[PDB]
Coordinates of C-alpha atoms and ligand atoms in Angstrom, one line a residue:
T1 CA 218.9 118.4 120.7
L2 CA 219.4 114.8 119.3
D3 CA 217.0 113.5 122.0
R4 CA 216.2 110.3 120.0
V5 CA 219.7 108.9 119.9
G6 CA 220.0 107.7 123.4
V7 CA 217.6 104.6 123.2
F8 CA 219.4 103.4 120.0
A9 CA 223.0 103.9 121.5
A10 CA 221.8 102.2 124.4
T11 CA 220.5 98.8 122.2
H12 CA 224.0 98.8 121.0
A13 CA 225.6 99.3 124.3
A14 CA 224.1 96.2 125.7
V15 CA 225.6 94.0 123.1
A16 CA 229.0 95.7 123.4
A17 CA 229.0 95.2 127.4
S18 CA 228.5 91.3 126.4
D19 CA 231.2 88.7 126.4
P20 CA 229.3 85.9 127.0
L21 CA 232.5 83.2 125.6
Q22 CA 234.7 85.3 127.8
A23 CA 236.8 86.2 125.2
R24 CA 238.0 89.5 125.4
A25 CA 241.7 88.8 126.1
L26 CA 241.6 86.1 123.5
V27 CA 240.4 88.7 120.5
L28 CA 243.2 91.2 121.5
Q29 CA 245.6 89.0 120.3
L30 CA 244.3 88.7 116.8
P31 CA 245.8 91.7 115.4
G32 CA 249.6 90.2 116.2
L33 CA 248.6 87.1 114.4
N34 CA 247.5 88.8 111.3
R35 CA 250.6 90.8 111.3
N36 CA 252.3 87.7 111.4
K37 CA 249.8 85.9 109.0
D38 CA 249.9 82.7 111.3
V39 CA 246.8 81.1 110.1
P40 CA 247.6 78.0 112.3
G41 CA 247.6 80.5 115.2
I42 CA 244.5 81.8 114.2
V43 CA 242.8 78.7 114.5
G44 CA 244.0 77.9 117.4
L45 CA 243.1 81.0 119.0
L46 CA 239.5 80.5 118.0
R47 CA 239.2 77.1 119.1
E48 CA 240.3 78.4 122.8
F49 CA 236.5 79.9 122.9
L50 CA 234.6 78.4 120.0
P51 CA 231.8 76.7 121.4
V52 CA 231.8 73.1 120.7
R53 CA 228.7 71.6 122.4
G54 CA 226.1 74.1 120.9
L55 CA 224.8 77.5 122.6
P56 CA 224.4 77.9 126.3
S57 CA 220.2 77.5 126.5
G58 CA 219.9 81.0 128.5
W59 CA 221.3 83.1 125.7
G60 CA 219.0 85.7 124.2
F61 CA 219.6 88.1 121.4
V62 CA 222.7 90.0 123.5
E63 CA 224.6 86.9 123.7
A64 CA 224.4 85.4 120.5
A65 CA 225.1 89.0 118.9
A66 CA 228.0 89.0 121.1
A67 CA 229.4 85.7 120.4
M68 CA 229.1 86.3 116.6
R69 CA 230.9 89.3 116.8
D70 CA 233.9 87.7 118.7
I71 CA 233.9 84.7 116.4
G72 CA 233.3 87.0 113.4
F73 CA 236.5 89.0 113.5
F74 CA 238.1 85.4 112.8
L75 CA 236.3 84.8 109.9
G76 CA 237.2 88.0 108.0
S77 CA 240.7 87.5 109.3
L78 CA 241.2 83.7 108.1
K79 CA 239.4 84.8 104.6
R80 CA 242.0 87.9 104.5
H81 CA 244.6 85.4 104.2
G82 CA 242.9 82.9 101.5
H83 CA 241.4 80.7 103.6
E84 CA 237.3 79.7 103.6
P85 CA 236.6 79.6 107.6
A86 CA 234.2 76.9 107.4
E87 CA 236.5 74.7 105.7
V88 CA 239.4 75.3 107.9
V89 CA 237.8 75.3 111.3
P90 CA 235.8 72.1 111.8
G91 CA 232.3 72.5 113.9
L92 CA 232.6 76.1 113.1
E93 CA 229.7 76.3 109.9
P94 CA 226.9 74.7 112.4
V95 CA 227.6 77.5 115.4
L96 CA 227.7 80.2 112.8
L97 CA 224.1 78.8 111.4
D98 CA 222.7 78.4 115.3
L99 CA 224.1 82.2 115.7
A100 CA 222.3 83.2 112.4
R101 CA 219.1 81.6 113.6
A102 CA 219.4 83.0 117.2
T103 CA 219.8 86.6 115.9
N104 CA 217.9 86.6 112.6
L105 CA 221.0 87.8 111.2
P106 CA 223.3 86.3 108.6
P107 CA 225.8 83.3 109.9
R108 CA 228.9 86.0 110.0
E109 CA 230.2 89.4 111.3
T110 CA 228.4 92.5 109.9
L111 CA 228.9 96.0 110.5
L112 CA 226.7 96.0 113.5
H113 CA 229.0 93.8 115.0
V114 CA 232.2 95.3 114.5
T115 CA 231.1 99.1 115.2
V116 CA 228.1 99.8 117.4
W117 CA 228.0 96.2 119.2
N118 CA 232.0 96.3 119.7
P119 CA 232.9 97.8 123.0
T120 CA 235.2 101.0 122.6
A121 CA 238.0 100.4 125.3
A122 CA 241.3 100.2 124.6
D123 CA 241.5 96.8 126.4
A124 CA 238.1 95.7 125.1
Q125 CA 237.7 96.6 121.7
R126 CA 237.7 94.0 119.1
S127 CA 239.9 94.7 115.7
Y128 CA 241.3 92.7 112.9
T129 CA 244.5 95.0 112.2
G130 CA 245.0 96.9 115.4
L131 CA 245.5 99.7 113.3
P132 CA 244.6 103.4 114.0
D133 CA 242.7 103.7 110.5
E134 CA 240.7 100.7 111.6
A135 CA 240.1 102.5 114.8
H136 CA 239.0 105.8 113.0
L137 CA 236.8 103.9 110.4
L138 CA 234.7 102.1 113.5
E139 CA 234.7 105.6 115.0
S140 CA 233.1 107.2 111.5
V141 CA 230.3 104.6 111.9
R142 CA 229.6 105.1 115.5
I143 CA 229.1 109.1 115.2
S144 CA 226.0 108.3 112.8
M145 CA 224.6 105.0 113.2
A146 CA 222.5 105.5 116.2
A147 CA 221.3 109.1 114.6
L148 CA 220.4 107.1 111.0
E149 CA 218.2 104.8 113.0
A150 CA 216.7 107.8 114.9
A151 CA 216.4 109.1 111.4
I152 CA 214.7 105.8 110.0
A153 CA 212.0 106.5 112.5
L154 CA 211.3 110.0 111.7
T155 CA 211.1 109.2 107.9
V156 CA 208.5 106.2 108.8
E157 CA 206.4 108.8 111.2
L158 CA 206.7 111.9 108.7
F159 CA 205.2 109.3 105.8
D160 CA 201.8 109.4 107.8
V161 CA 202.0 113.4 108.0
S162 CA 200.1 115.5 105.8
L163 CA 201.8 118.4 104.1
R164 CA 199.2 120.7 105.0
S165 CA 200.1 120.4 108.8
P166 CA 202.8 122.5 110.0
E167 CA 204.1 119.5 111.6
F168 CA 205.3 118.4 108.1
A169 CA 207.9 121.1 108.2
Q170 CA 208.8 120.3 111.6
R171 CA 209.3 116.8 111.5
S172 CA 211.5 117.5 108.1
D173 CA 213.6 119.8 109.8
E174 CA 214.1 117.2 112.7
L175 CA 214.6 114.8 110.0
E176 CA 217.8 116.7 108.4
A177 CA 219.2 117.4 111.6
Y178 CA 219.8 113.4 112.5
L179 CA 221.1 112.9 108.9
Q180 CA 223.6 115.7 109.4
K181 CA 225.5 113.2 111.5
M182 CA 226.1 111.2 107.9
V183 CA 227.9 114.3 106.9
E184 CA 230.0 114.4 109.9
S185 CA 231.1 110.7 109.8
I186 CA 232.5 111.2 106.4
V187 CA 234.2 114.8 107.2
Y188 CA 235.7 112.4 110.2
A189 CA 236.7 109.6 107.4
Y190 CA 238.4 112.2 105.6
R191 CA 240.3 113.8 108.0
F192 CA 241.5 110.7 110.1
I193 CA 241.7 107.6 107.8
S194 CA 244.5 107.2 105.1
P195 CA 243.2 105.8 102.0
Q196 CA 246.7 104.1 101.1
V197 CA 246.2 102.2 104.4
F198 CA 242.5 101.4 104.1
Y199 CA 242.9 100.0 100.7
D200 CA 246.2 98.0 101.2
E201 CA 245.8 96.9 105.0
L202 CA 241.7 97.0 106.0
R203 CA 240.1 96.0 102.6
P204 CA 241.7 92.6 102.3
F205 CA 239.8 91.8 105.7
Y206 CA 236.3 92.4 104.1
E207 CA 236.2 89.8 101.3
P208 CA 233.0 87.5 101.2
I209 CA 232.7 84.0 102.7
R210 CA 230.9 81.0 101.9
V211 CA 228.5 79.4 104.8
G212 CA 225.6 77.3 104.3
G213 CA 226.1 77.1 100.1
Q214 CA 226.2 80.6 99.7
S215 CA 228.5 83.9 99.8
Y216 CA 228.4 86.3 102.5
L217 CA 229.7 90.0 102.2
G218 CA 232.0 91.2 104.7
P219 CA 231.0 93.9 107.1
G220 CA 231.3 97.3 105.4
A221 CA 229.8 100.8 106.4
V222 CA 227.7 100.2 103.1
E223 CA 225.5 97.8 105.2
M224 CA 224.3 101.2 107.1
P225 CA 220.6 100.9 107.0
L226 CA 220.4 104.5 104.9
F227 CA 219.1 102.8 102.0
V228 CA 216.3 101.7 103.9
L229 CA 215.7 105.2 104.8
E230 CA 215.8 106.5 101.2
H231 CA 213.8 103.1 100.1
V232 CA 210.7 104.8 102.1
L233 CA 211.6 108.5 101.5
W234 CA 211.9 108.5 97.6
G235 CA 213.0 104.9 96.4
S236 CA 210.2 102.3 96.9
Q237 CA 209.0 103.0 93.3
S238 CA 212.1 103.5 91.2
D239 CA 212.2 100.8 88.1
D240 CA 216.1 101.5 88.1
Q241 CA 217.2 97.9 88.1
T242 CA 220.9 98.7 89.2
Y243 CA 219.6 100.5 92.1
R244 CA 216.9 97.7 93.0
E245 CA 219.6 95.1 92.9
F246 CA 222.0 97.4 95.4
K247 CA 219.3 97.7 98.0
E248 CA 218.0 94.0 97.5
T249 CA 221.8 92.8 98.0
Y250 CA 222.5 94.7 101.6
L251 CA 219.1 94.0 102.9
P252 CA 219.7 90.4 104.7
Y253 CA 222.6 92.4 106.7
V254 CA 220.2 95.3 108.5
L255 CA 218.3 94.7 111.6
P256 CA 214.9 92.5 111.2
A257 CA 213.1 95.7 112.3
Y258 CA 214.5 97.5 109.0
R259 CA 213.8 94.5 106.8
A260 CA 210.4 94.5 107.9
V261 CA 210.0 98.5 107.0
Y262 CA 211.7 97.8 103.8
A263 CA 209.1 95.2 102.9
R264 CA 206.0 97.4 104.2
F265 CA 207.0 100.3 101.7
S266 CA 207.9 98.3 98.6
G267 CA 205.9 98.8 95.6
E268 CA 203.8 101.4 97.4
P269 CA 204.3 105.3 96.4
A270 CA 207.5 106.6 98.1
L271 CA 207.1 109.6 100.8
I272 CA 208.1 112.2 98.4
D273 CA 205.8 110.8 95.8
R274 CA 203.0 111.2 98.2
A275 CA 204.2 114.5 99.3
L276 CA 204.3 115.8 95.6
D277 CA 200.7 114.5 94.8
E278 CA 199.6 116.1 97.9
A279 CA 201.2 119.5 96.7
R280 CA 199.9 119.4 93.1
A281 CA 196.4 118.8 94.3
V282 CA 196.4 121.5 97.2
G283 CA 198.6 124.0 96.0
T284 CA 201.7 125.8 96.9
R285 CA 199.6 128.8 98.2
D286 CA 199.2 126.9 101.4
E287 CA 202.1 128.0 103.5
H288 CA 202.3 124.8 105.1
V289 CA 202.9 123.1 101.7
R290 CA 205.6 125.6 100.5
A291 CA 207.2 125.2 104.5
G292 CA 207.2 121.4 104.2
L293 CA 208.3 121.1 100.3
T294 CA 211.3 123.7 101.3
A295 CA 212.3 121.6 104.6
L296 CA 211.9 118.5 102.4
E297 CA 214.4 120.0 99.8
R298 CA 217.0 120.6 102.9
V299 CA 216.7 116.5 103.5
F300 CA 217.9 116.0 100.3
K301 CA 220.8 118.5 100.4
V302 CA 221.8 116.8 103.3
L303 CA 221.9 113.4 101.8
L304 CA 223.8 114.9 99.0
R305 CA 226.5 116.6 101.2
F306 CA 227.1 112.7 102.5
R307 CA 227.0 111.2 99.3
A308 CA 229.0 113.5 96.9
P309 CA 232.0 113.4 99.3
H310 CA 231.5 110.1 99.8
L311 CA 232.2 109.1 96.3
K312 CA 235.0 111.4 96.4
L313 CA 236.6 109.4 99.6
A314 CA 235.7 105.8 97.8
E315 CA 237.7 107.1 94.4
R316 CA 240.9 108.2 96.4
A317 CA 240.8 104.9 97.9
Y318 CA 240.3 103.1 94.5
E319 CA 243.1 105.2 93.1
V320 CA 245.8 103.5 94.9
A321 CA 235.4 103.0 92.4
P322 CA 232.1 100.6 92.0
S323 CA 229.7 102.2 89.3
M324 CA 227.1 102.1 91.7
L325 CA 228.0 104.7 93.7
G326 CA 227.9 107.4 90.6
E327 CA 224.6 106.1 89.8
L328 CA 223.0 106.6 93.3
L329 CA 224.2 109.7 93.5
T330 CA 222.4 110.8 90.1
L331 CA 219.0 109.3 91.3
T332 CA 219.6 111.8 94.8
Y333 CA 220.0 114.4 92.3
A334 CA 216.9 113.7 90.5
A335 CA 214.9 113.3 93.6
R336 CA 215.6 116.6 94.9
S337 CA 215.1 118.2 91.7
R338 CA 211.6 116.6 91.7
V339 CA 211.2 118.5 95.0
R340 CA 212.4 121.6 93.8
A341 CA 210.9 121.8 90.7
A342 CA 207.4 121.8 92.6
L343 CA 208.7 125.1 94.6
Ligands
HEM1 C1 237.7 105.3 103.1 C2 236.7 104.9 103.3 C3 235.9 104.6 102.6 C4 235.6 103.7 101.2 C5 236.8 103.4 100.5 C6 234.3 103.4 100.9 C7 234.0 102.4 99.8 C8 232.8 102.5 99.5 C9 232.6 101.8 98.6 C10 233.2 101.1 97.1 C11 231.0 101.6 98.4 C12 230.3 100.7 97.4 C13 229.8 99.2 97.9 C14 231.1 98.5 97.9 O1 231.8 98.3 96.9 O2 231.8 98.1 99.4 C15 230.0 102.1 99.2 C16 229.2 102.3 99.7 C17 228.4 102.9 100.9 N1 229.3 103.7 101.7 FE1 231.8 104.0 102.1 N2 233.4 103.8 102.0 C18 234.3 104.2 102.8 C19 233.8 104.8 104.1 C20 232.4 105.0 104.8 C21 231.9 105.6 105.8 C22 232.8 106.1 106.9 C23 230.7 105.7 105.7 C24 229.6 106.2 106.5 C25 229.8 106.2 108.2 C26 230.1 104.7 104.4 C27 229.4 104.6 104.0 C28 228.4 104.0 103.0 C29 227.0 104.0 102.5 C30 225.7 104.5 103.1 C31 227.2 102.9 101.1 C32 225.9 102.8 100.2 C33 226.1 103.7 99.3 C34 225.2 105.4 99.5 O3 224.7 105.3 100.3 O4 226.0 106.4 98.9 N3 231.5 104.5 103.9 N4 231.7 103.0 100.1
CYN2 C1 231.6 101.6 102.5 N1 231.6 100.2 103.0

């Protein structure tokens, strides 16, 4: 059914299988040290595998991303205990900058590093805390990431598909099916992740750190390139300043290819702007136009089935939220409503 997922999951598995600093047995020791708030021990453990002689010259993207993952868990940990990692680990910042250069990603761990690039076995999976809730959080992202990447590709493909073609309805239907995985992620998070443990125990590990004279955010699910998908789908031409700033904030943390997708579509009319213009010119008497628009409305429905329950999850956590979530929700409803009004 979701036949496009495989190639994305295989690209993640390559990084997850890589251990170029031979760090697996070492990183497993980190949760114990975190529980004990043993800052000197955390540094000492990192120095057991941190390269001091620059990066091995035969490394490609896979090795450098895997290295960033394994050092990365130490970065959020050190900052969790109140320390700038670059300040307490001499020689660390150059290695972080070298790995940023090798991966074209920021100089710390991102969501990708800690979820899909992180091996799944109990004797391999890297973790800040070792807690069941952190493991369930990783699983919730693994449920939908590959499917989301397939969805980005489908959205880009749909963008060049005429609403007059029966291919428009078919592509949209297929798109909707991939985006249902985001819904499955939030349902999973609801079932398995305690907001008490999240806010008190996990959230402290996601503070920003300073590298290269700026601040880089911690590896949250917010970094999922869903904002790129919707930039193409409906948001590229938005003049809403809060929204624009949101997208620009997280842009540095997504894969290079999705930063390029983002740039390609910026300014330019979004998919639904073009679709609705096409519908207004040709008319909804055209069977394919009607079917296309109907299928497109279902795409917005599934986005809303992710977004509204995600907002309640976040509020339940903050109870024991950032206004941006409410505003994005509002924008999504208005986009869907534009699609409905065309019908
Ligand atoms: C208890 C768990 C969670 C909490 C408390 C939470 C909270 C938040 C918060 C506060 C934001 C706004 C940015 C920020 O301040 O970090 C955000 C954004 C976002 N989060 Fe979560 N989140 C949780 C789980 C998840 C999961 C499981 C996913 C998907 C697998 C997810 C996906 C997203 C996305 C895509 C955004 C961007 C906003 C949007 O697209 O609507 N989050 N979340
Ligand atoms: C959601 N980070």
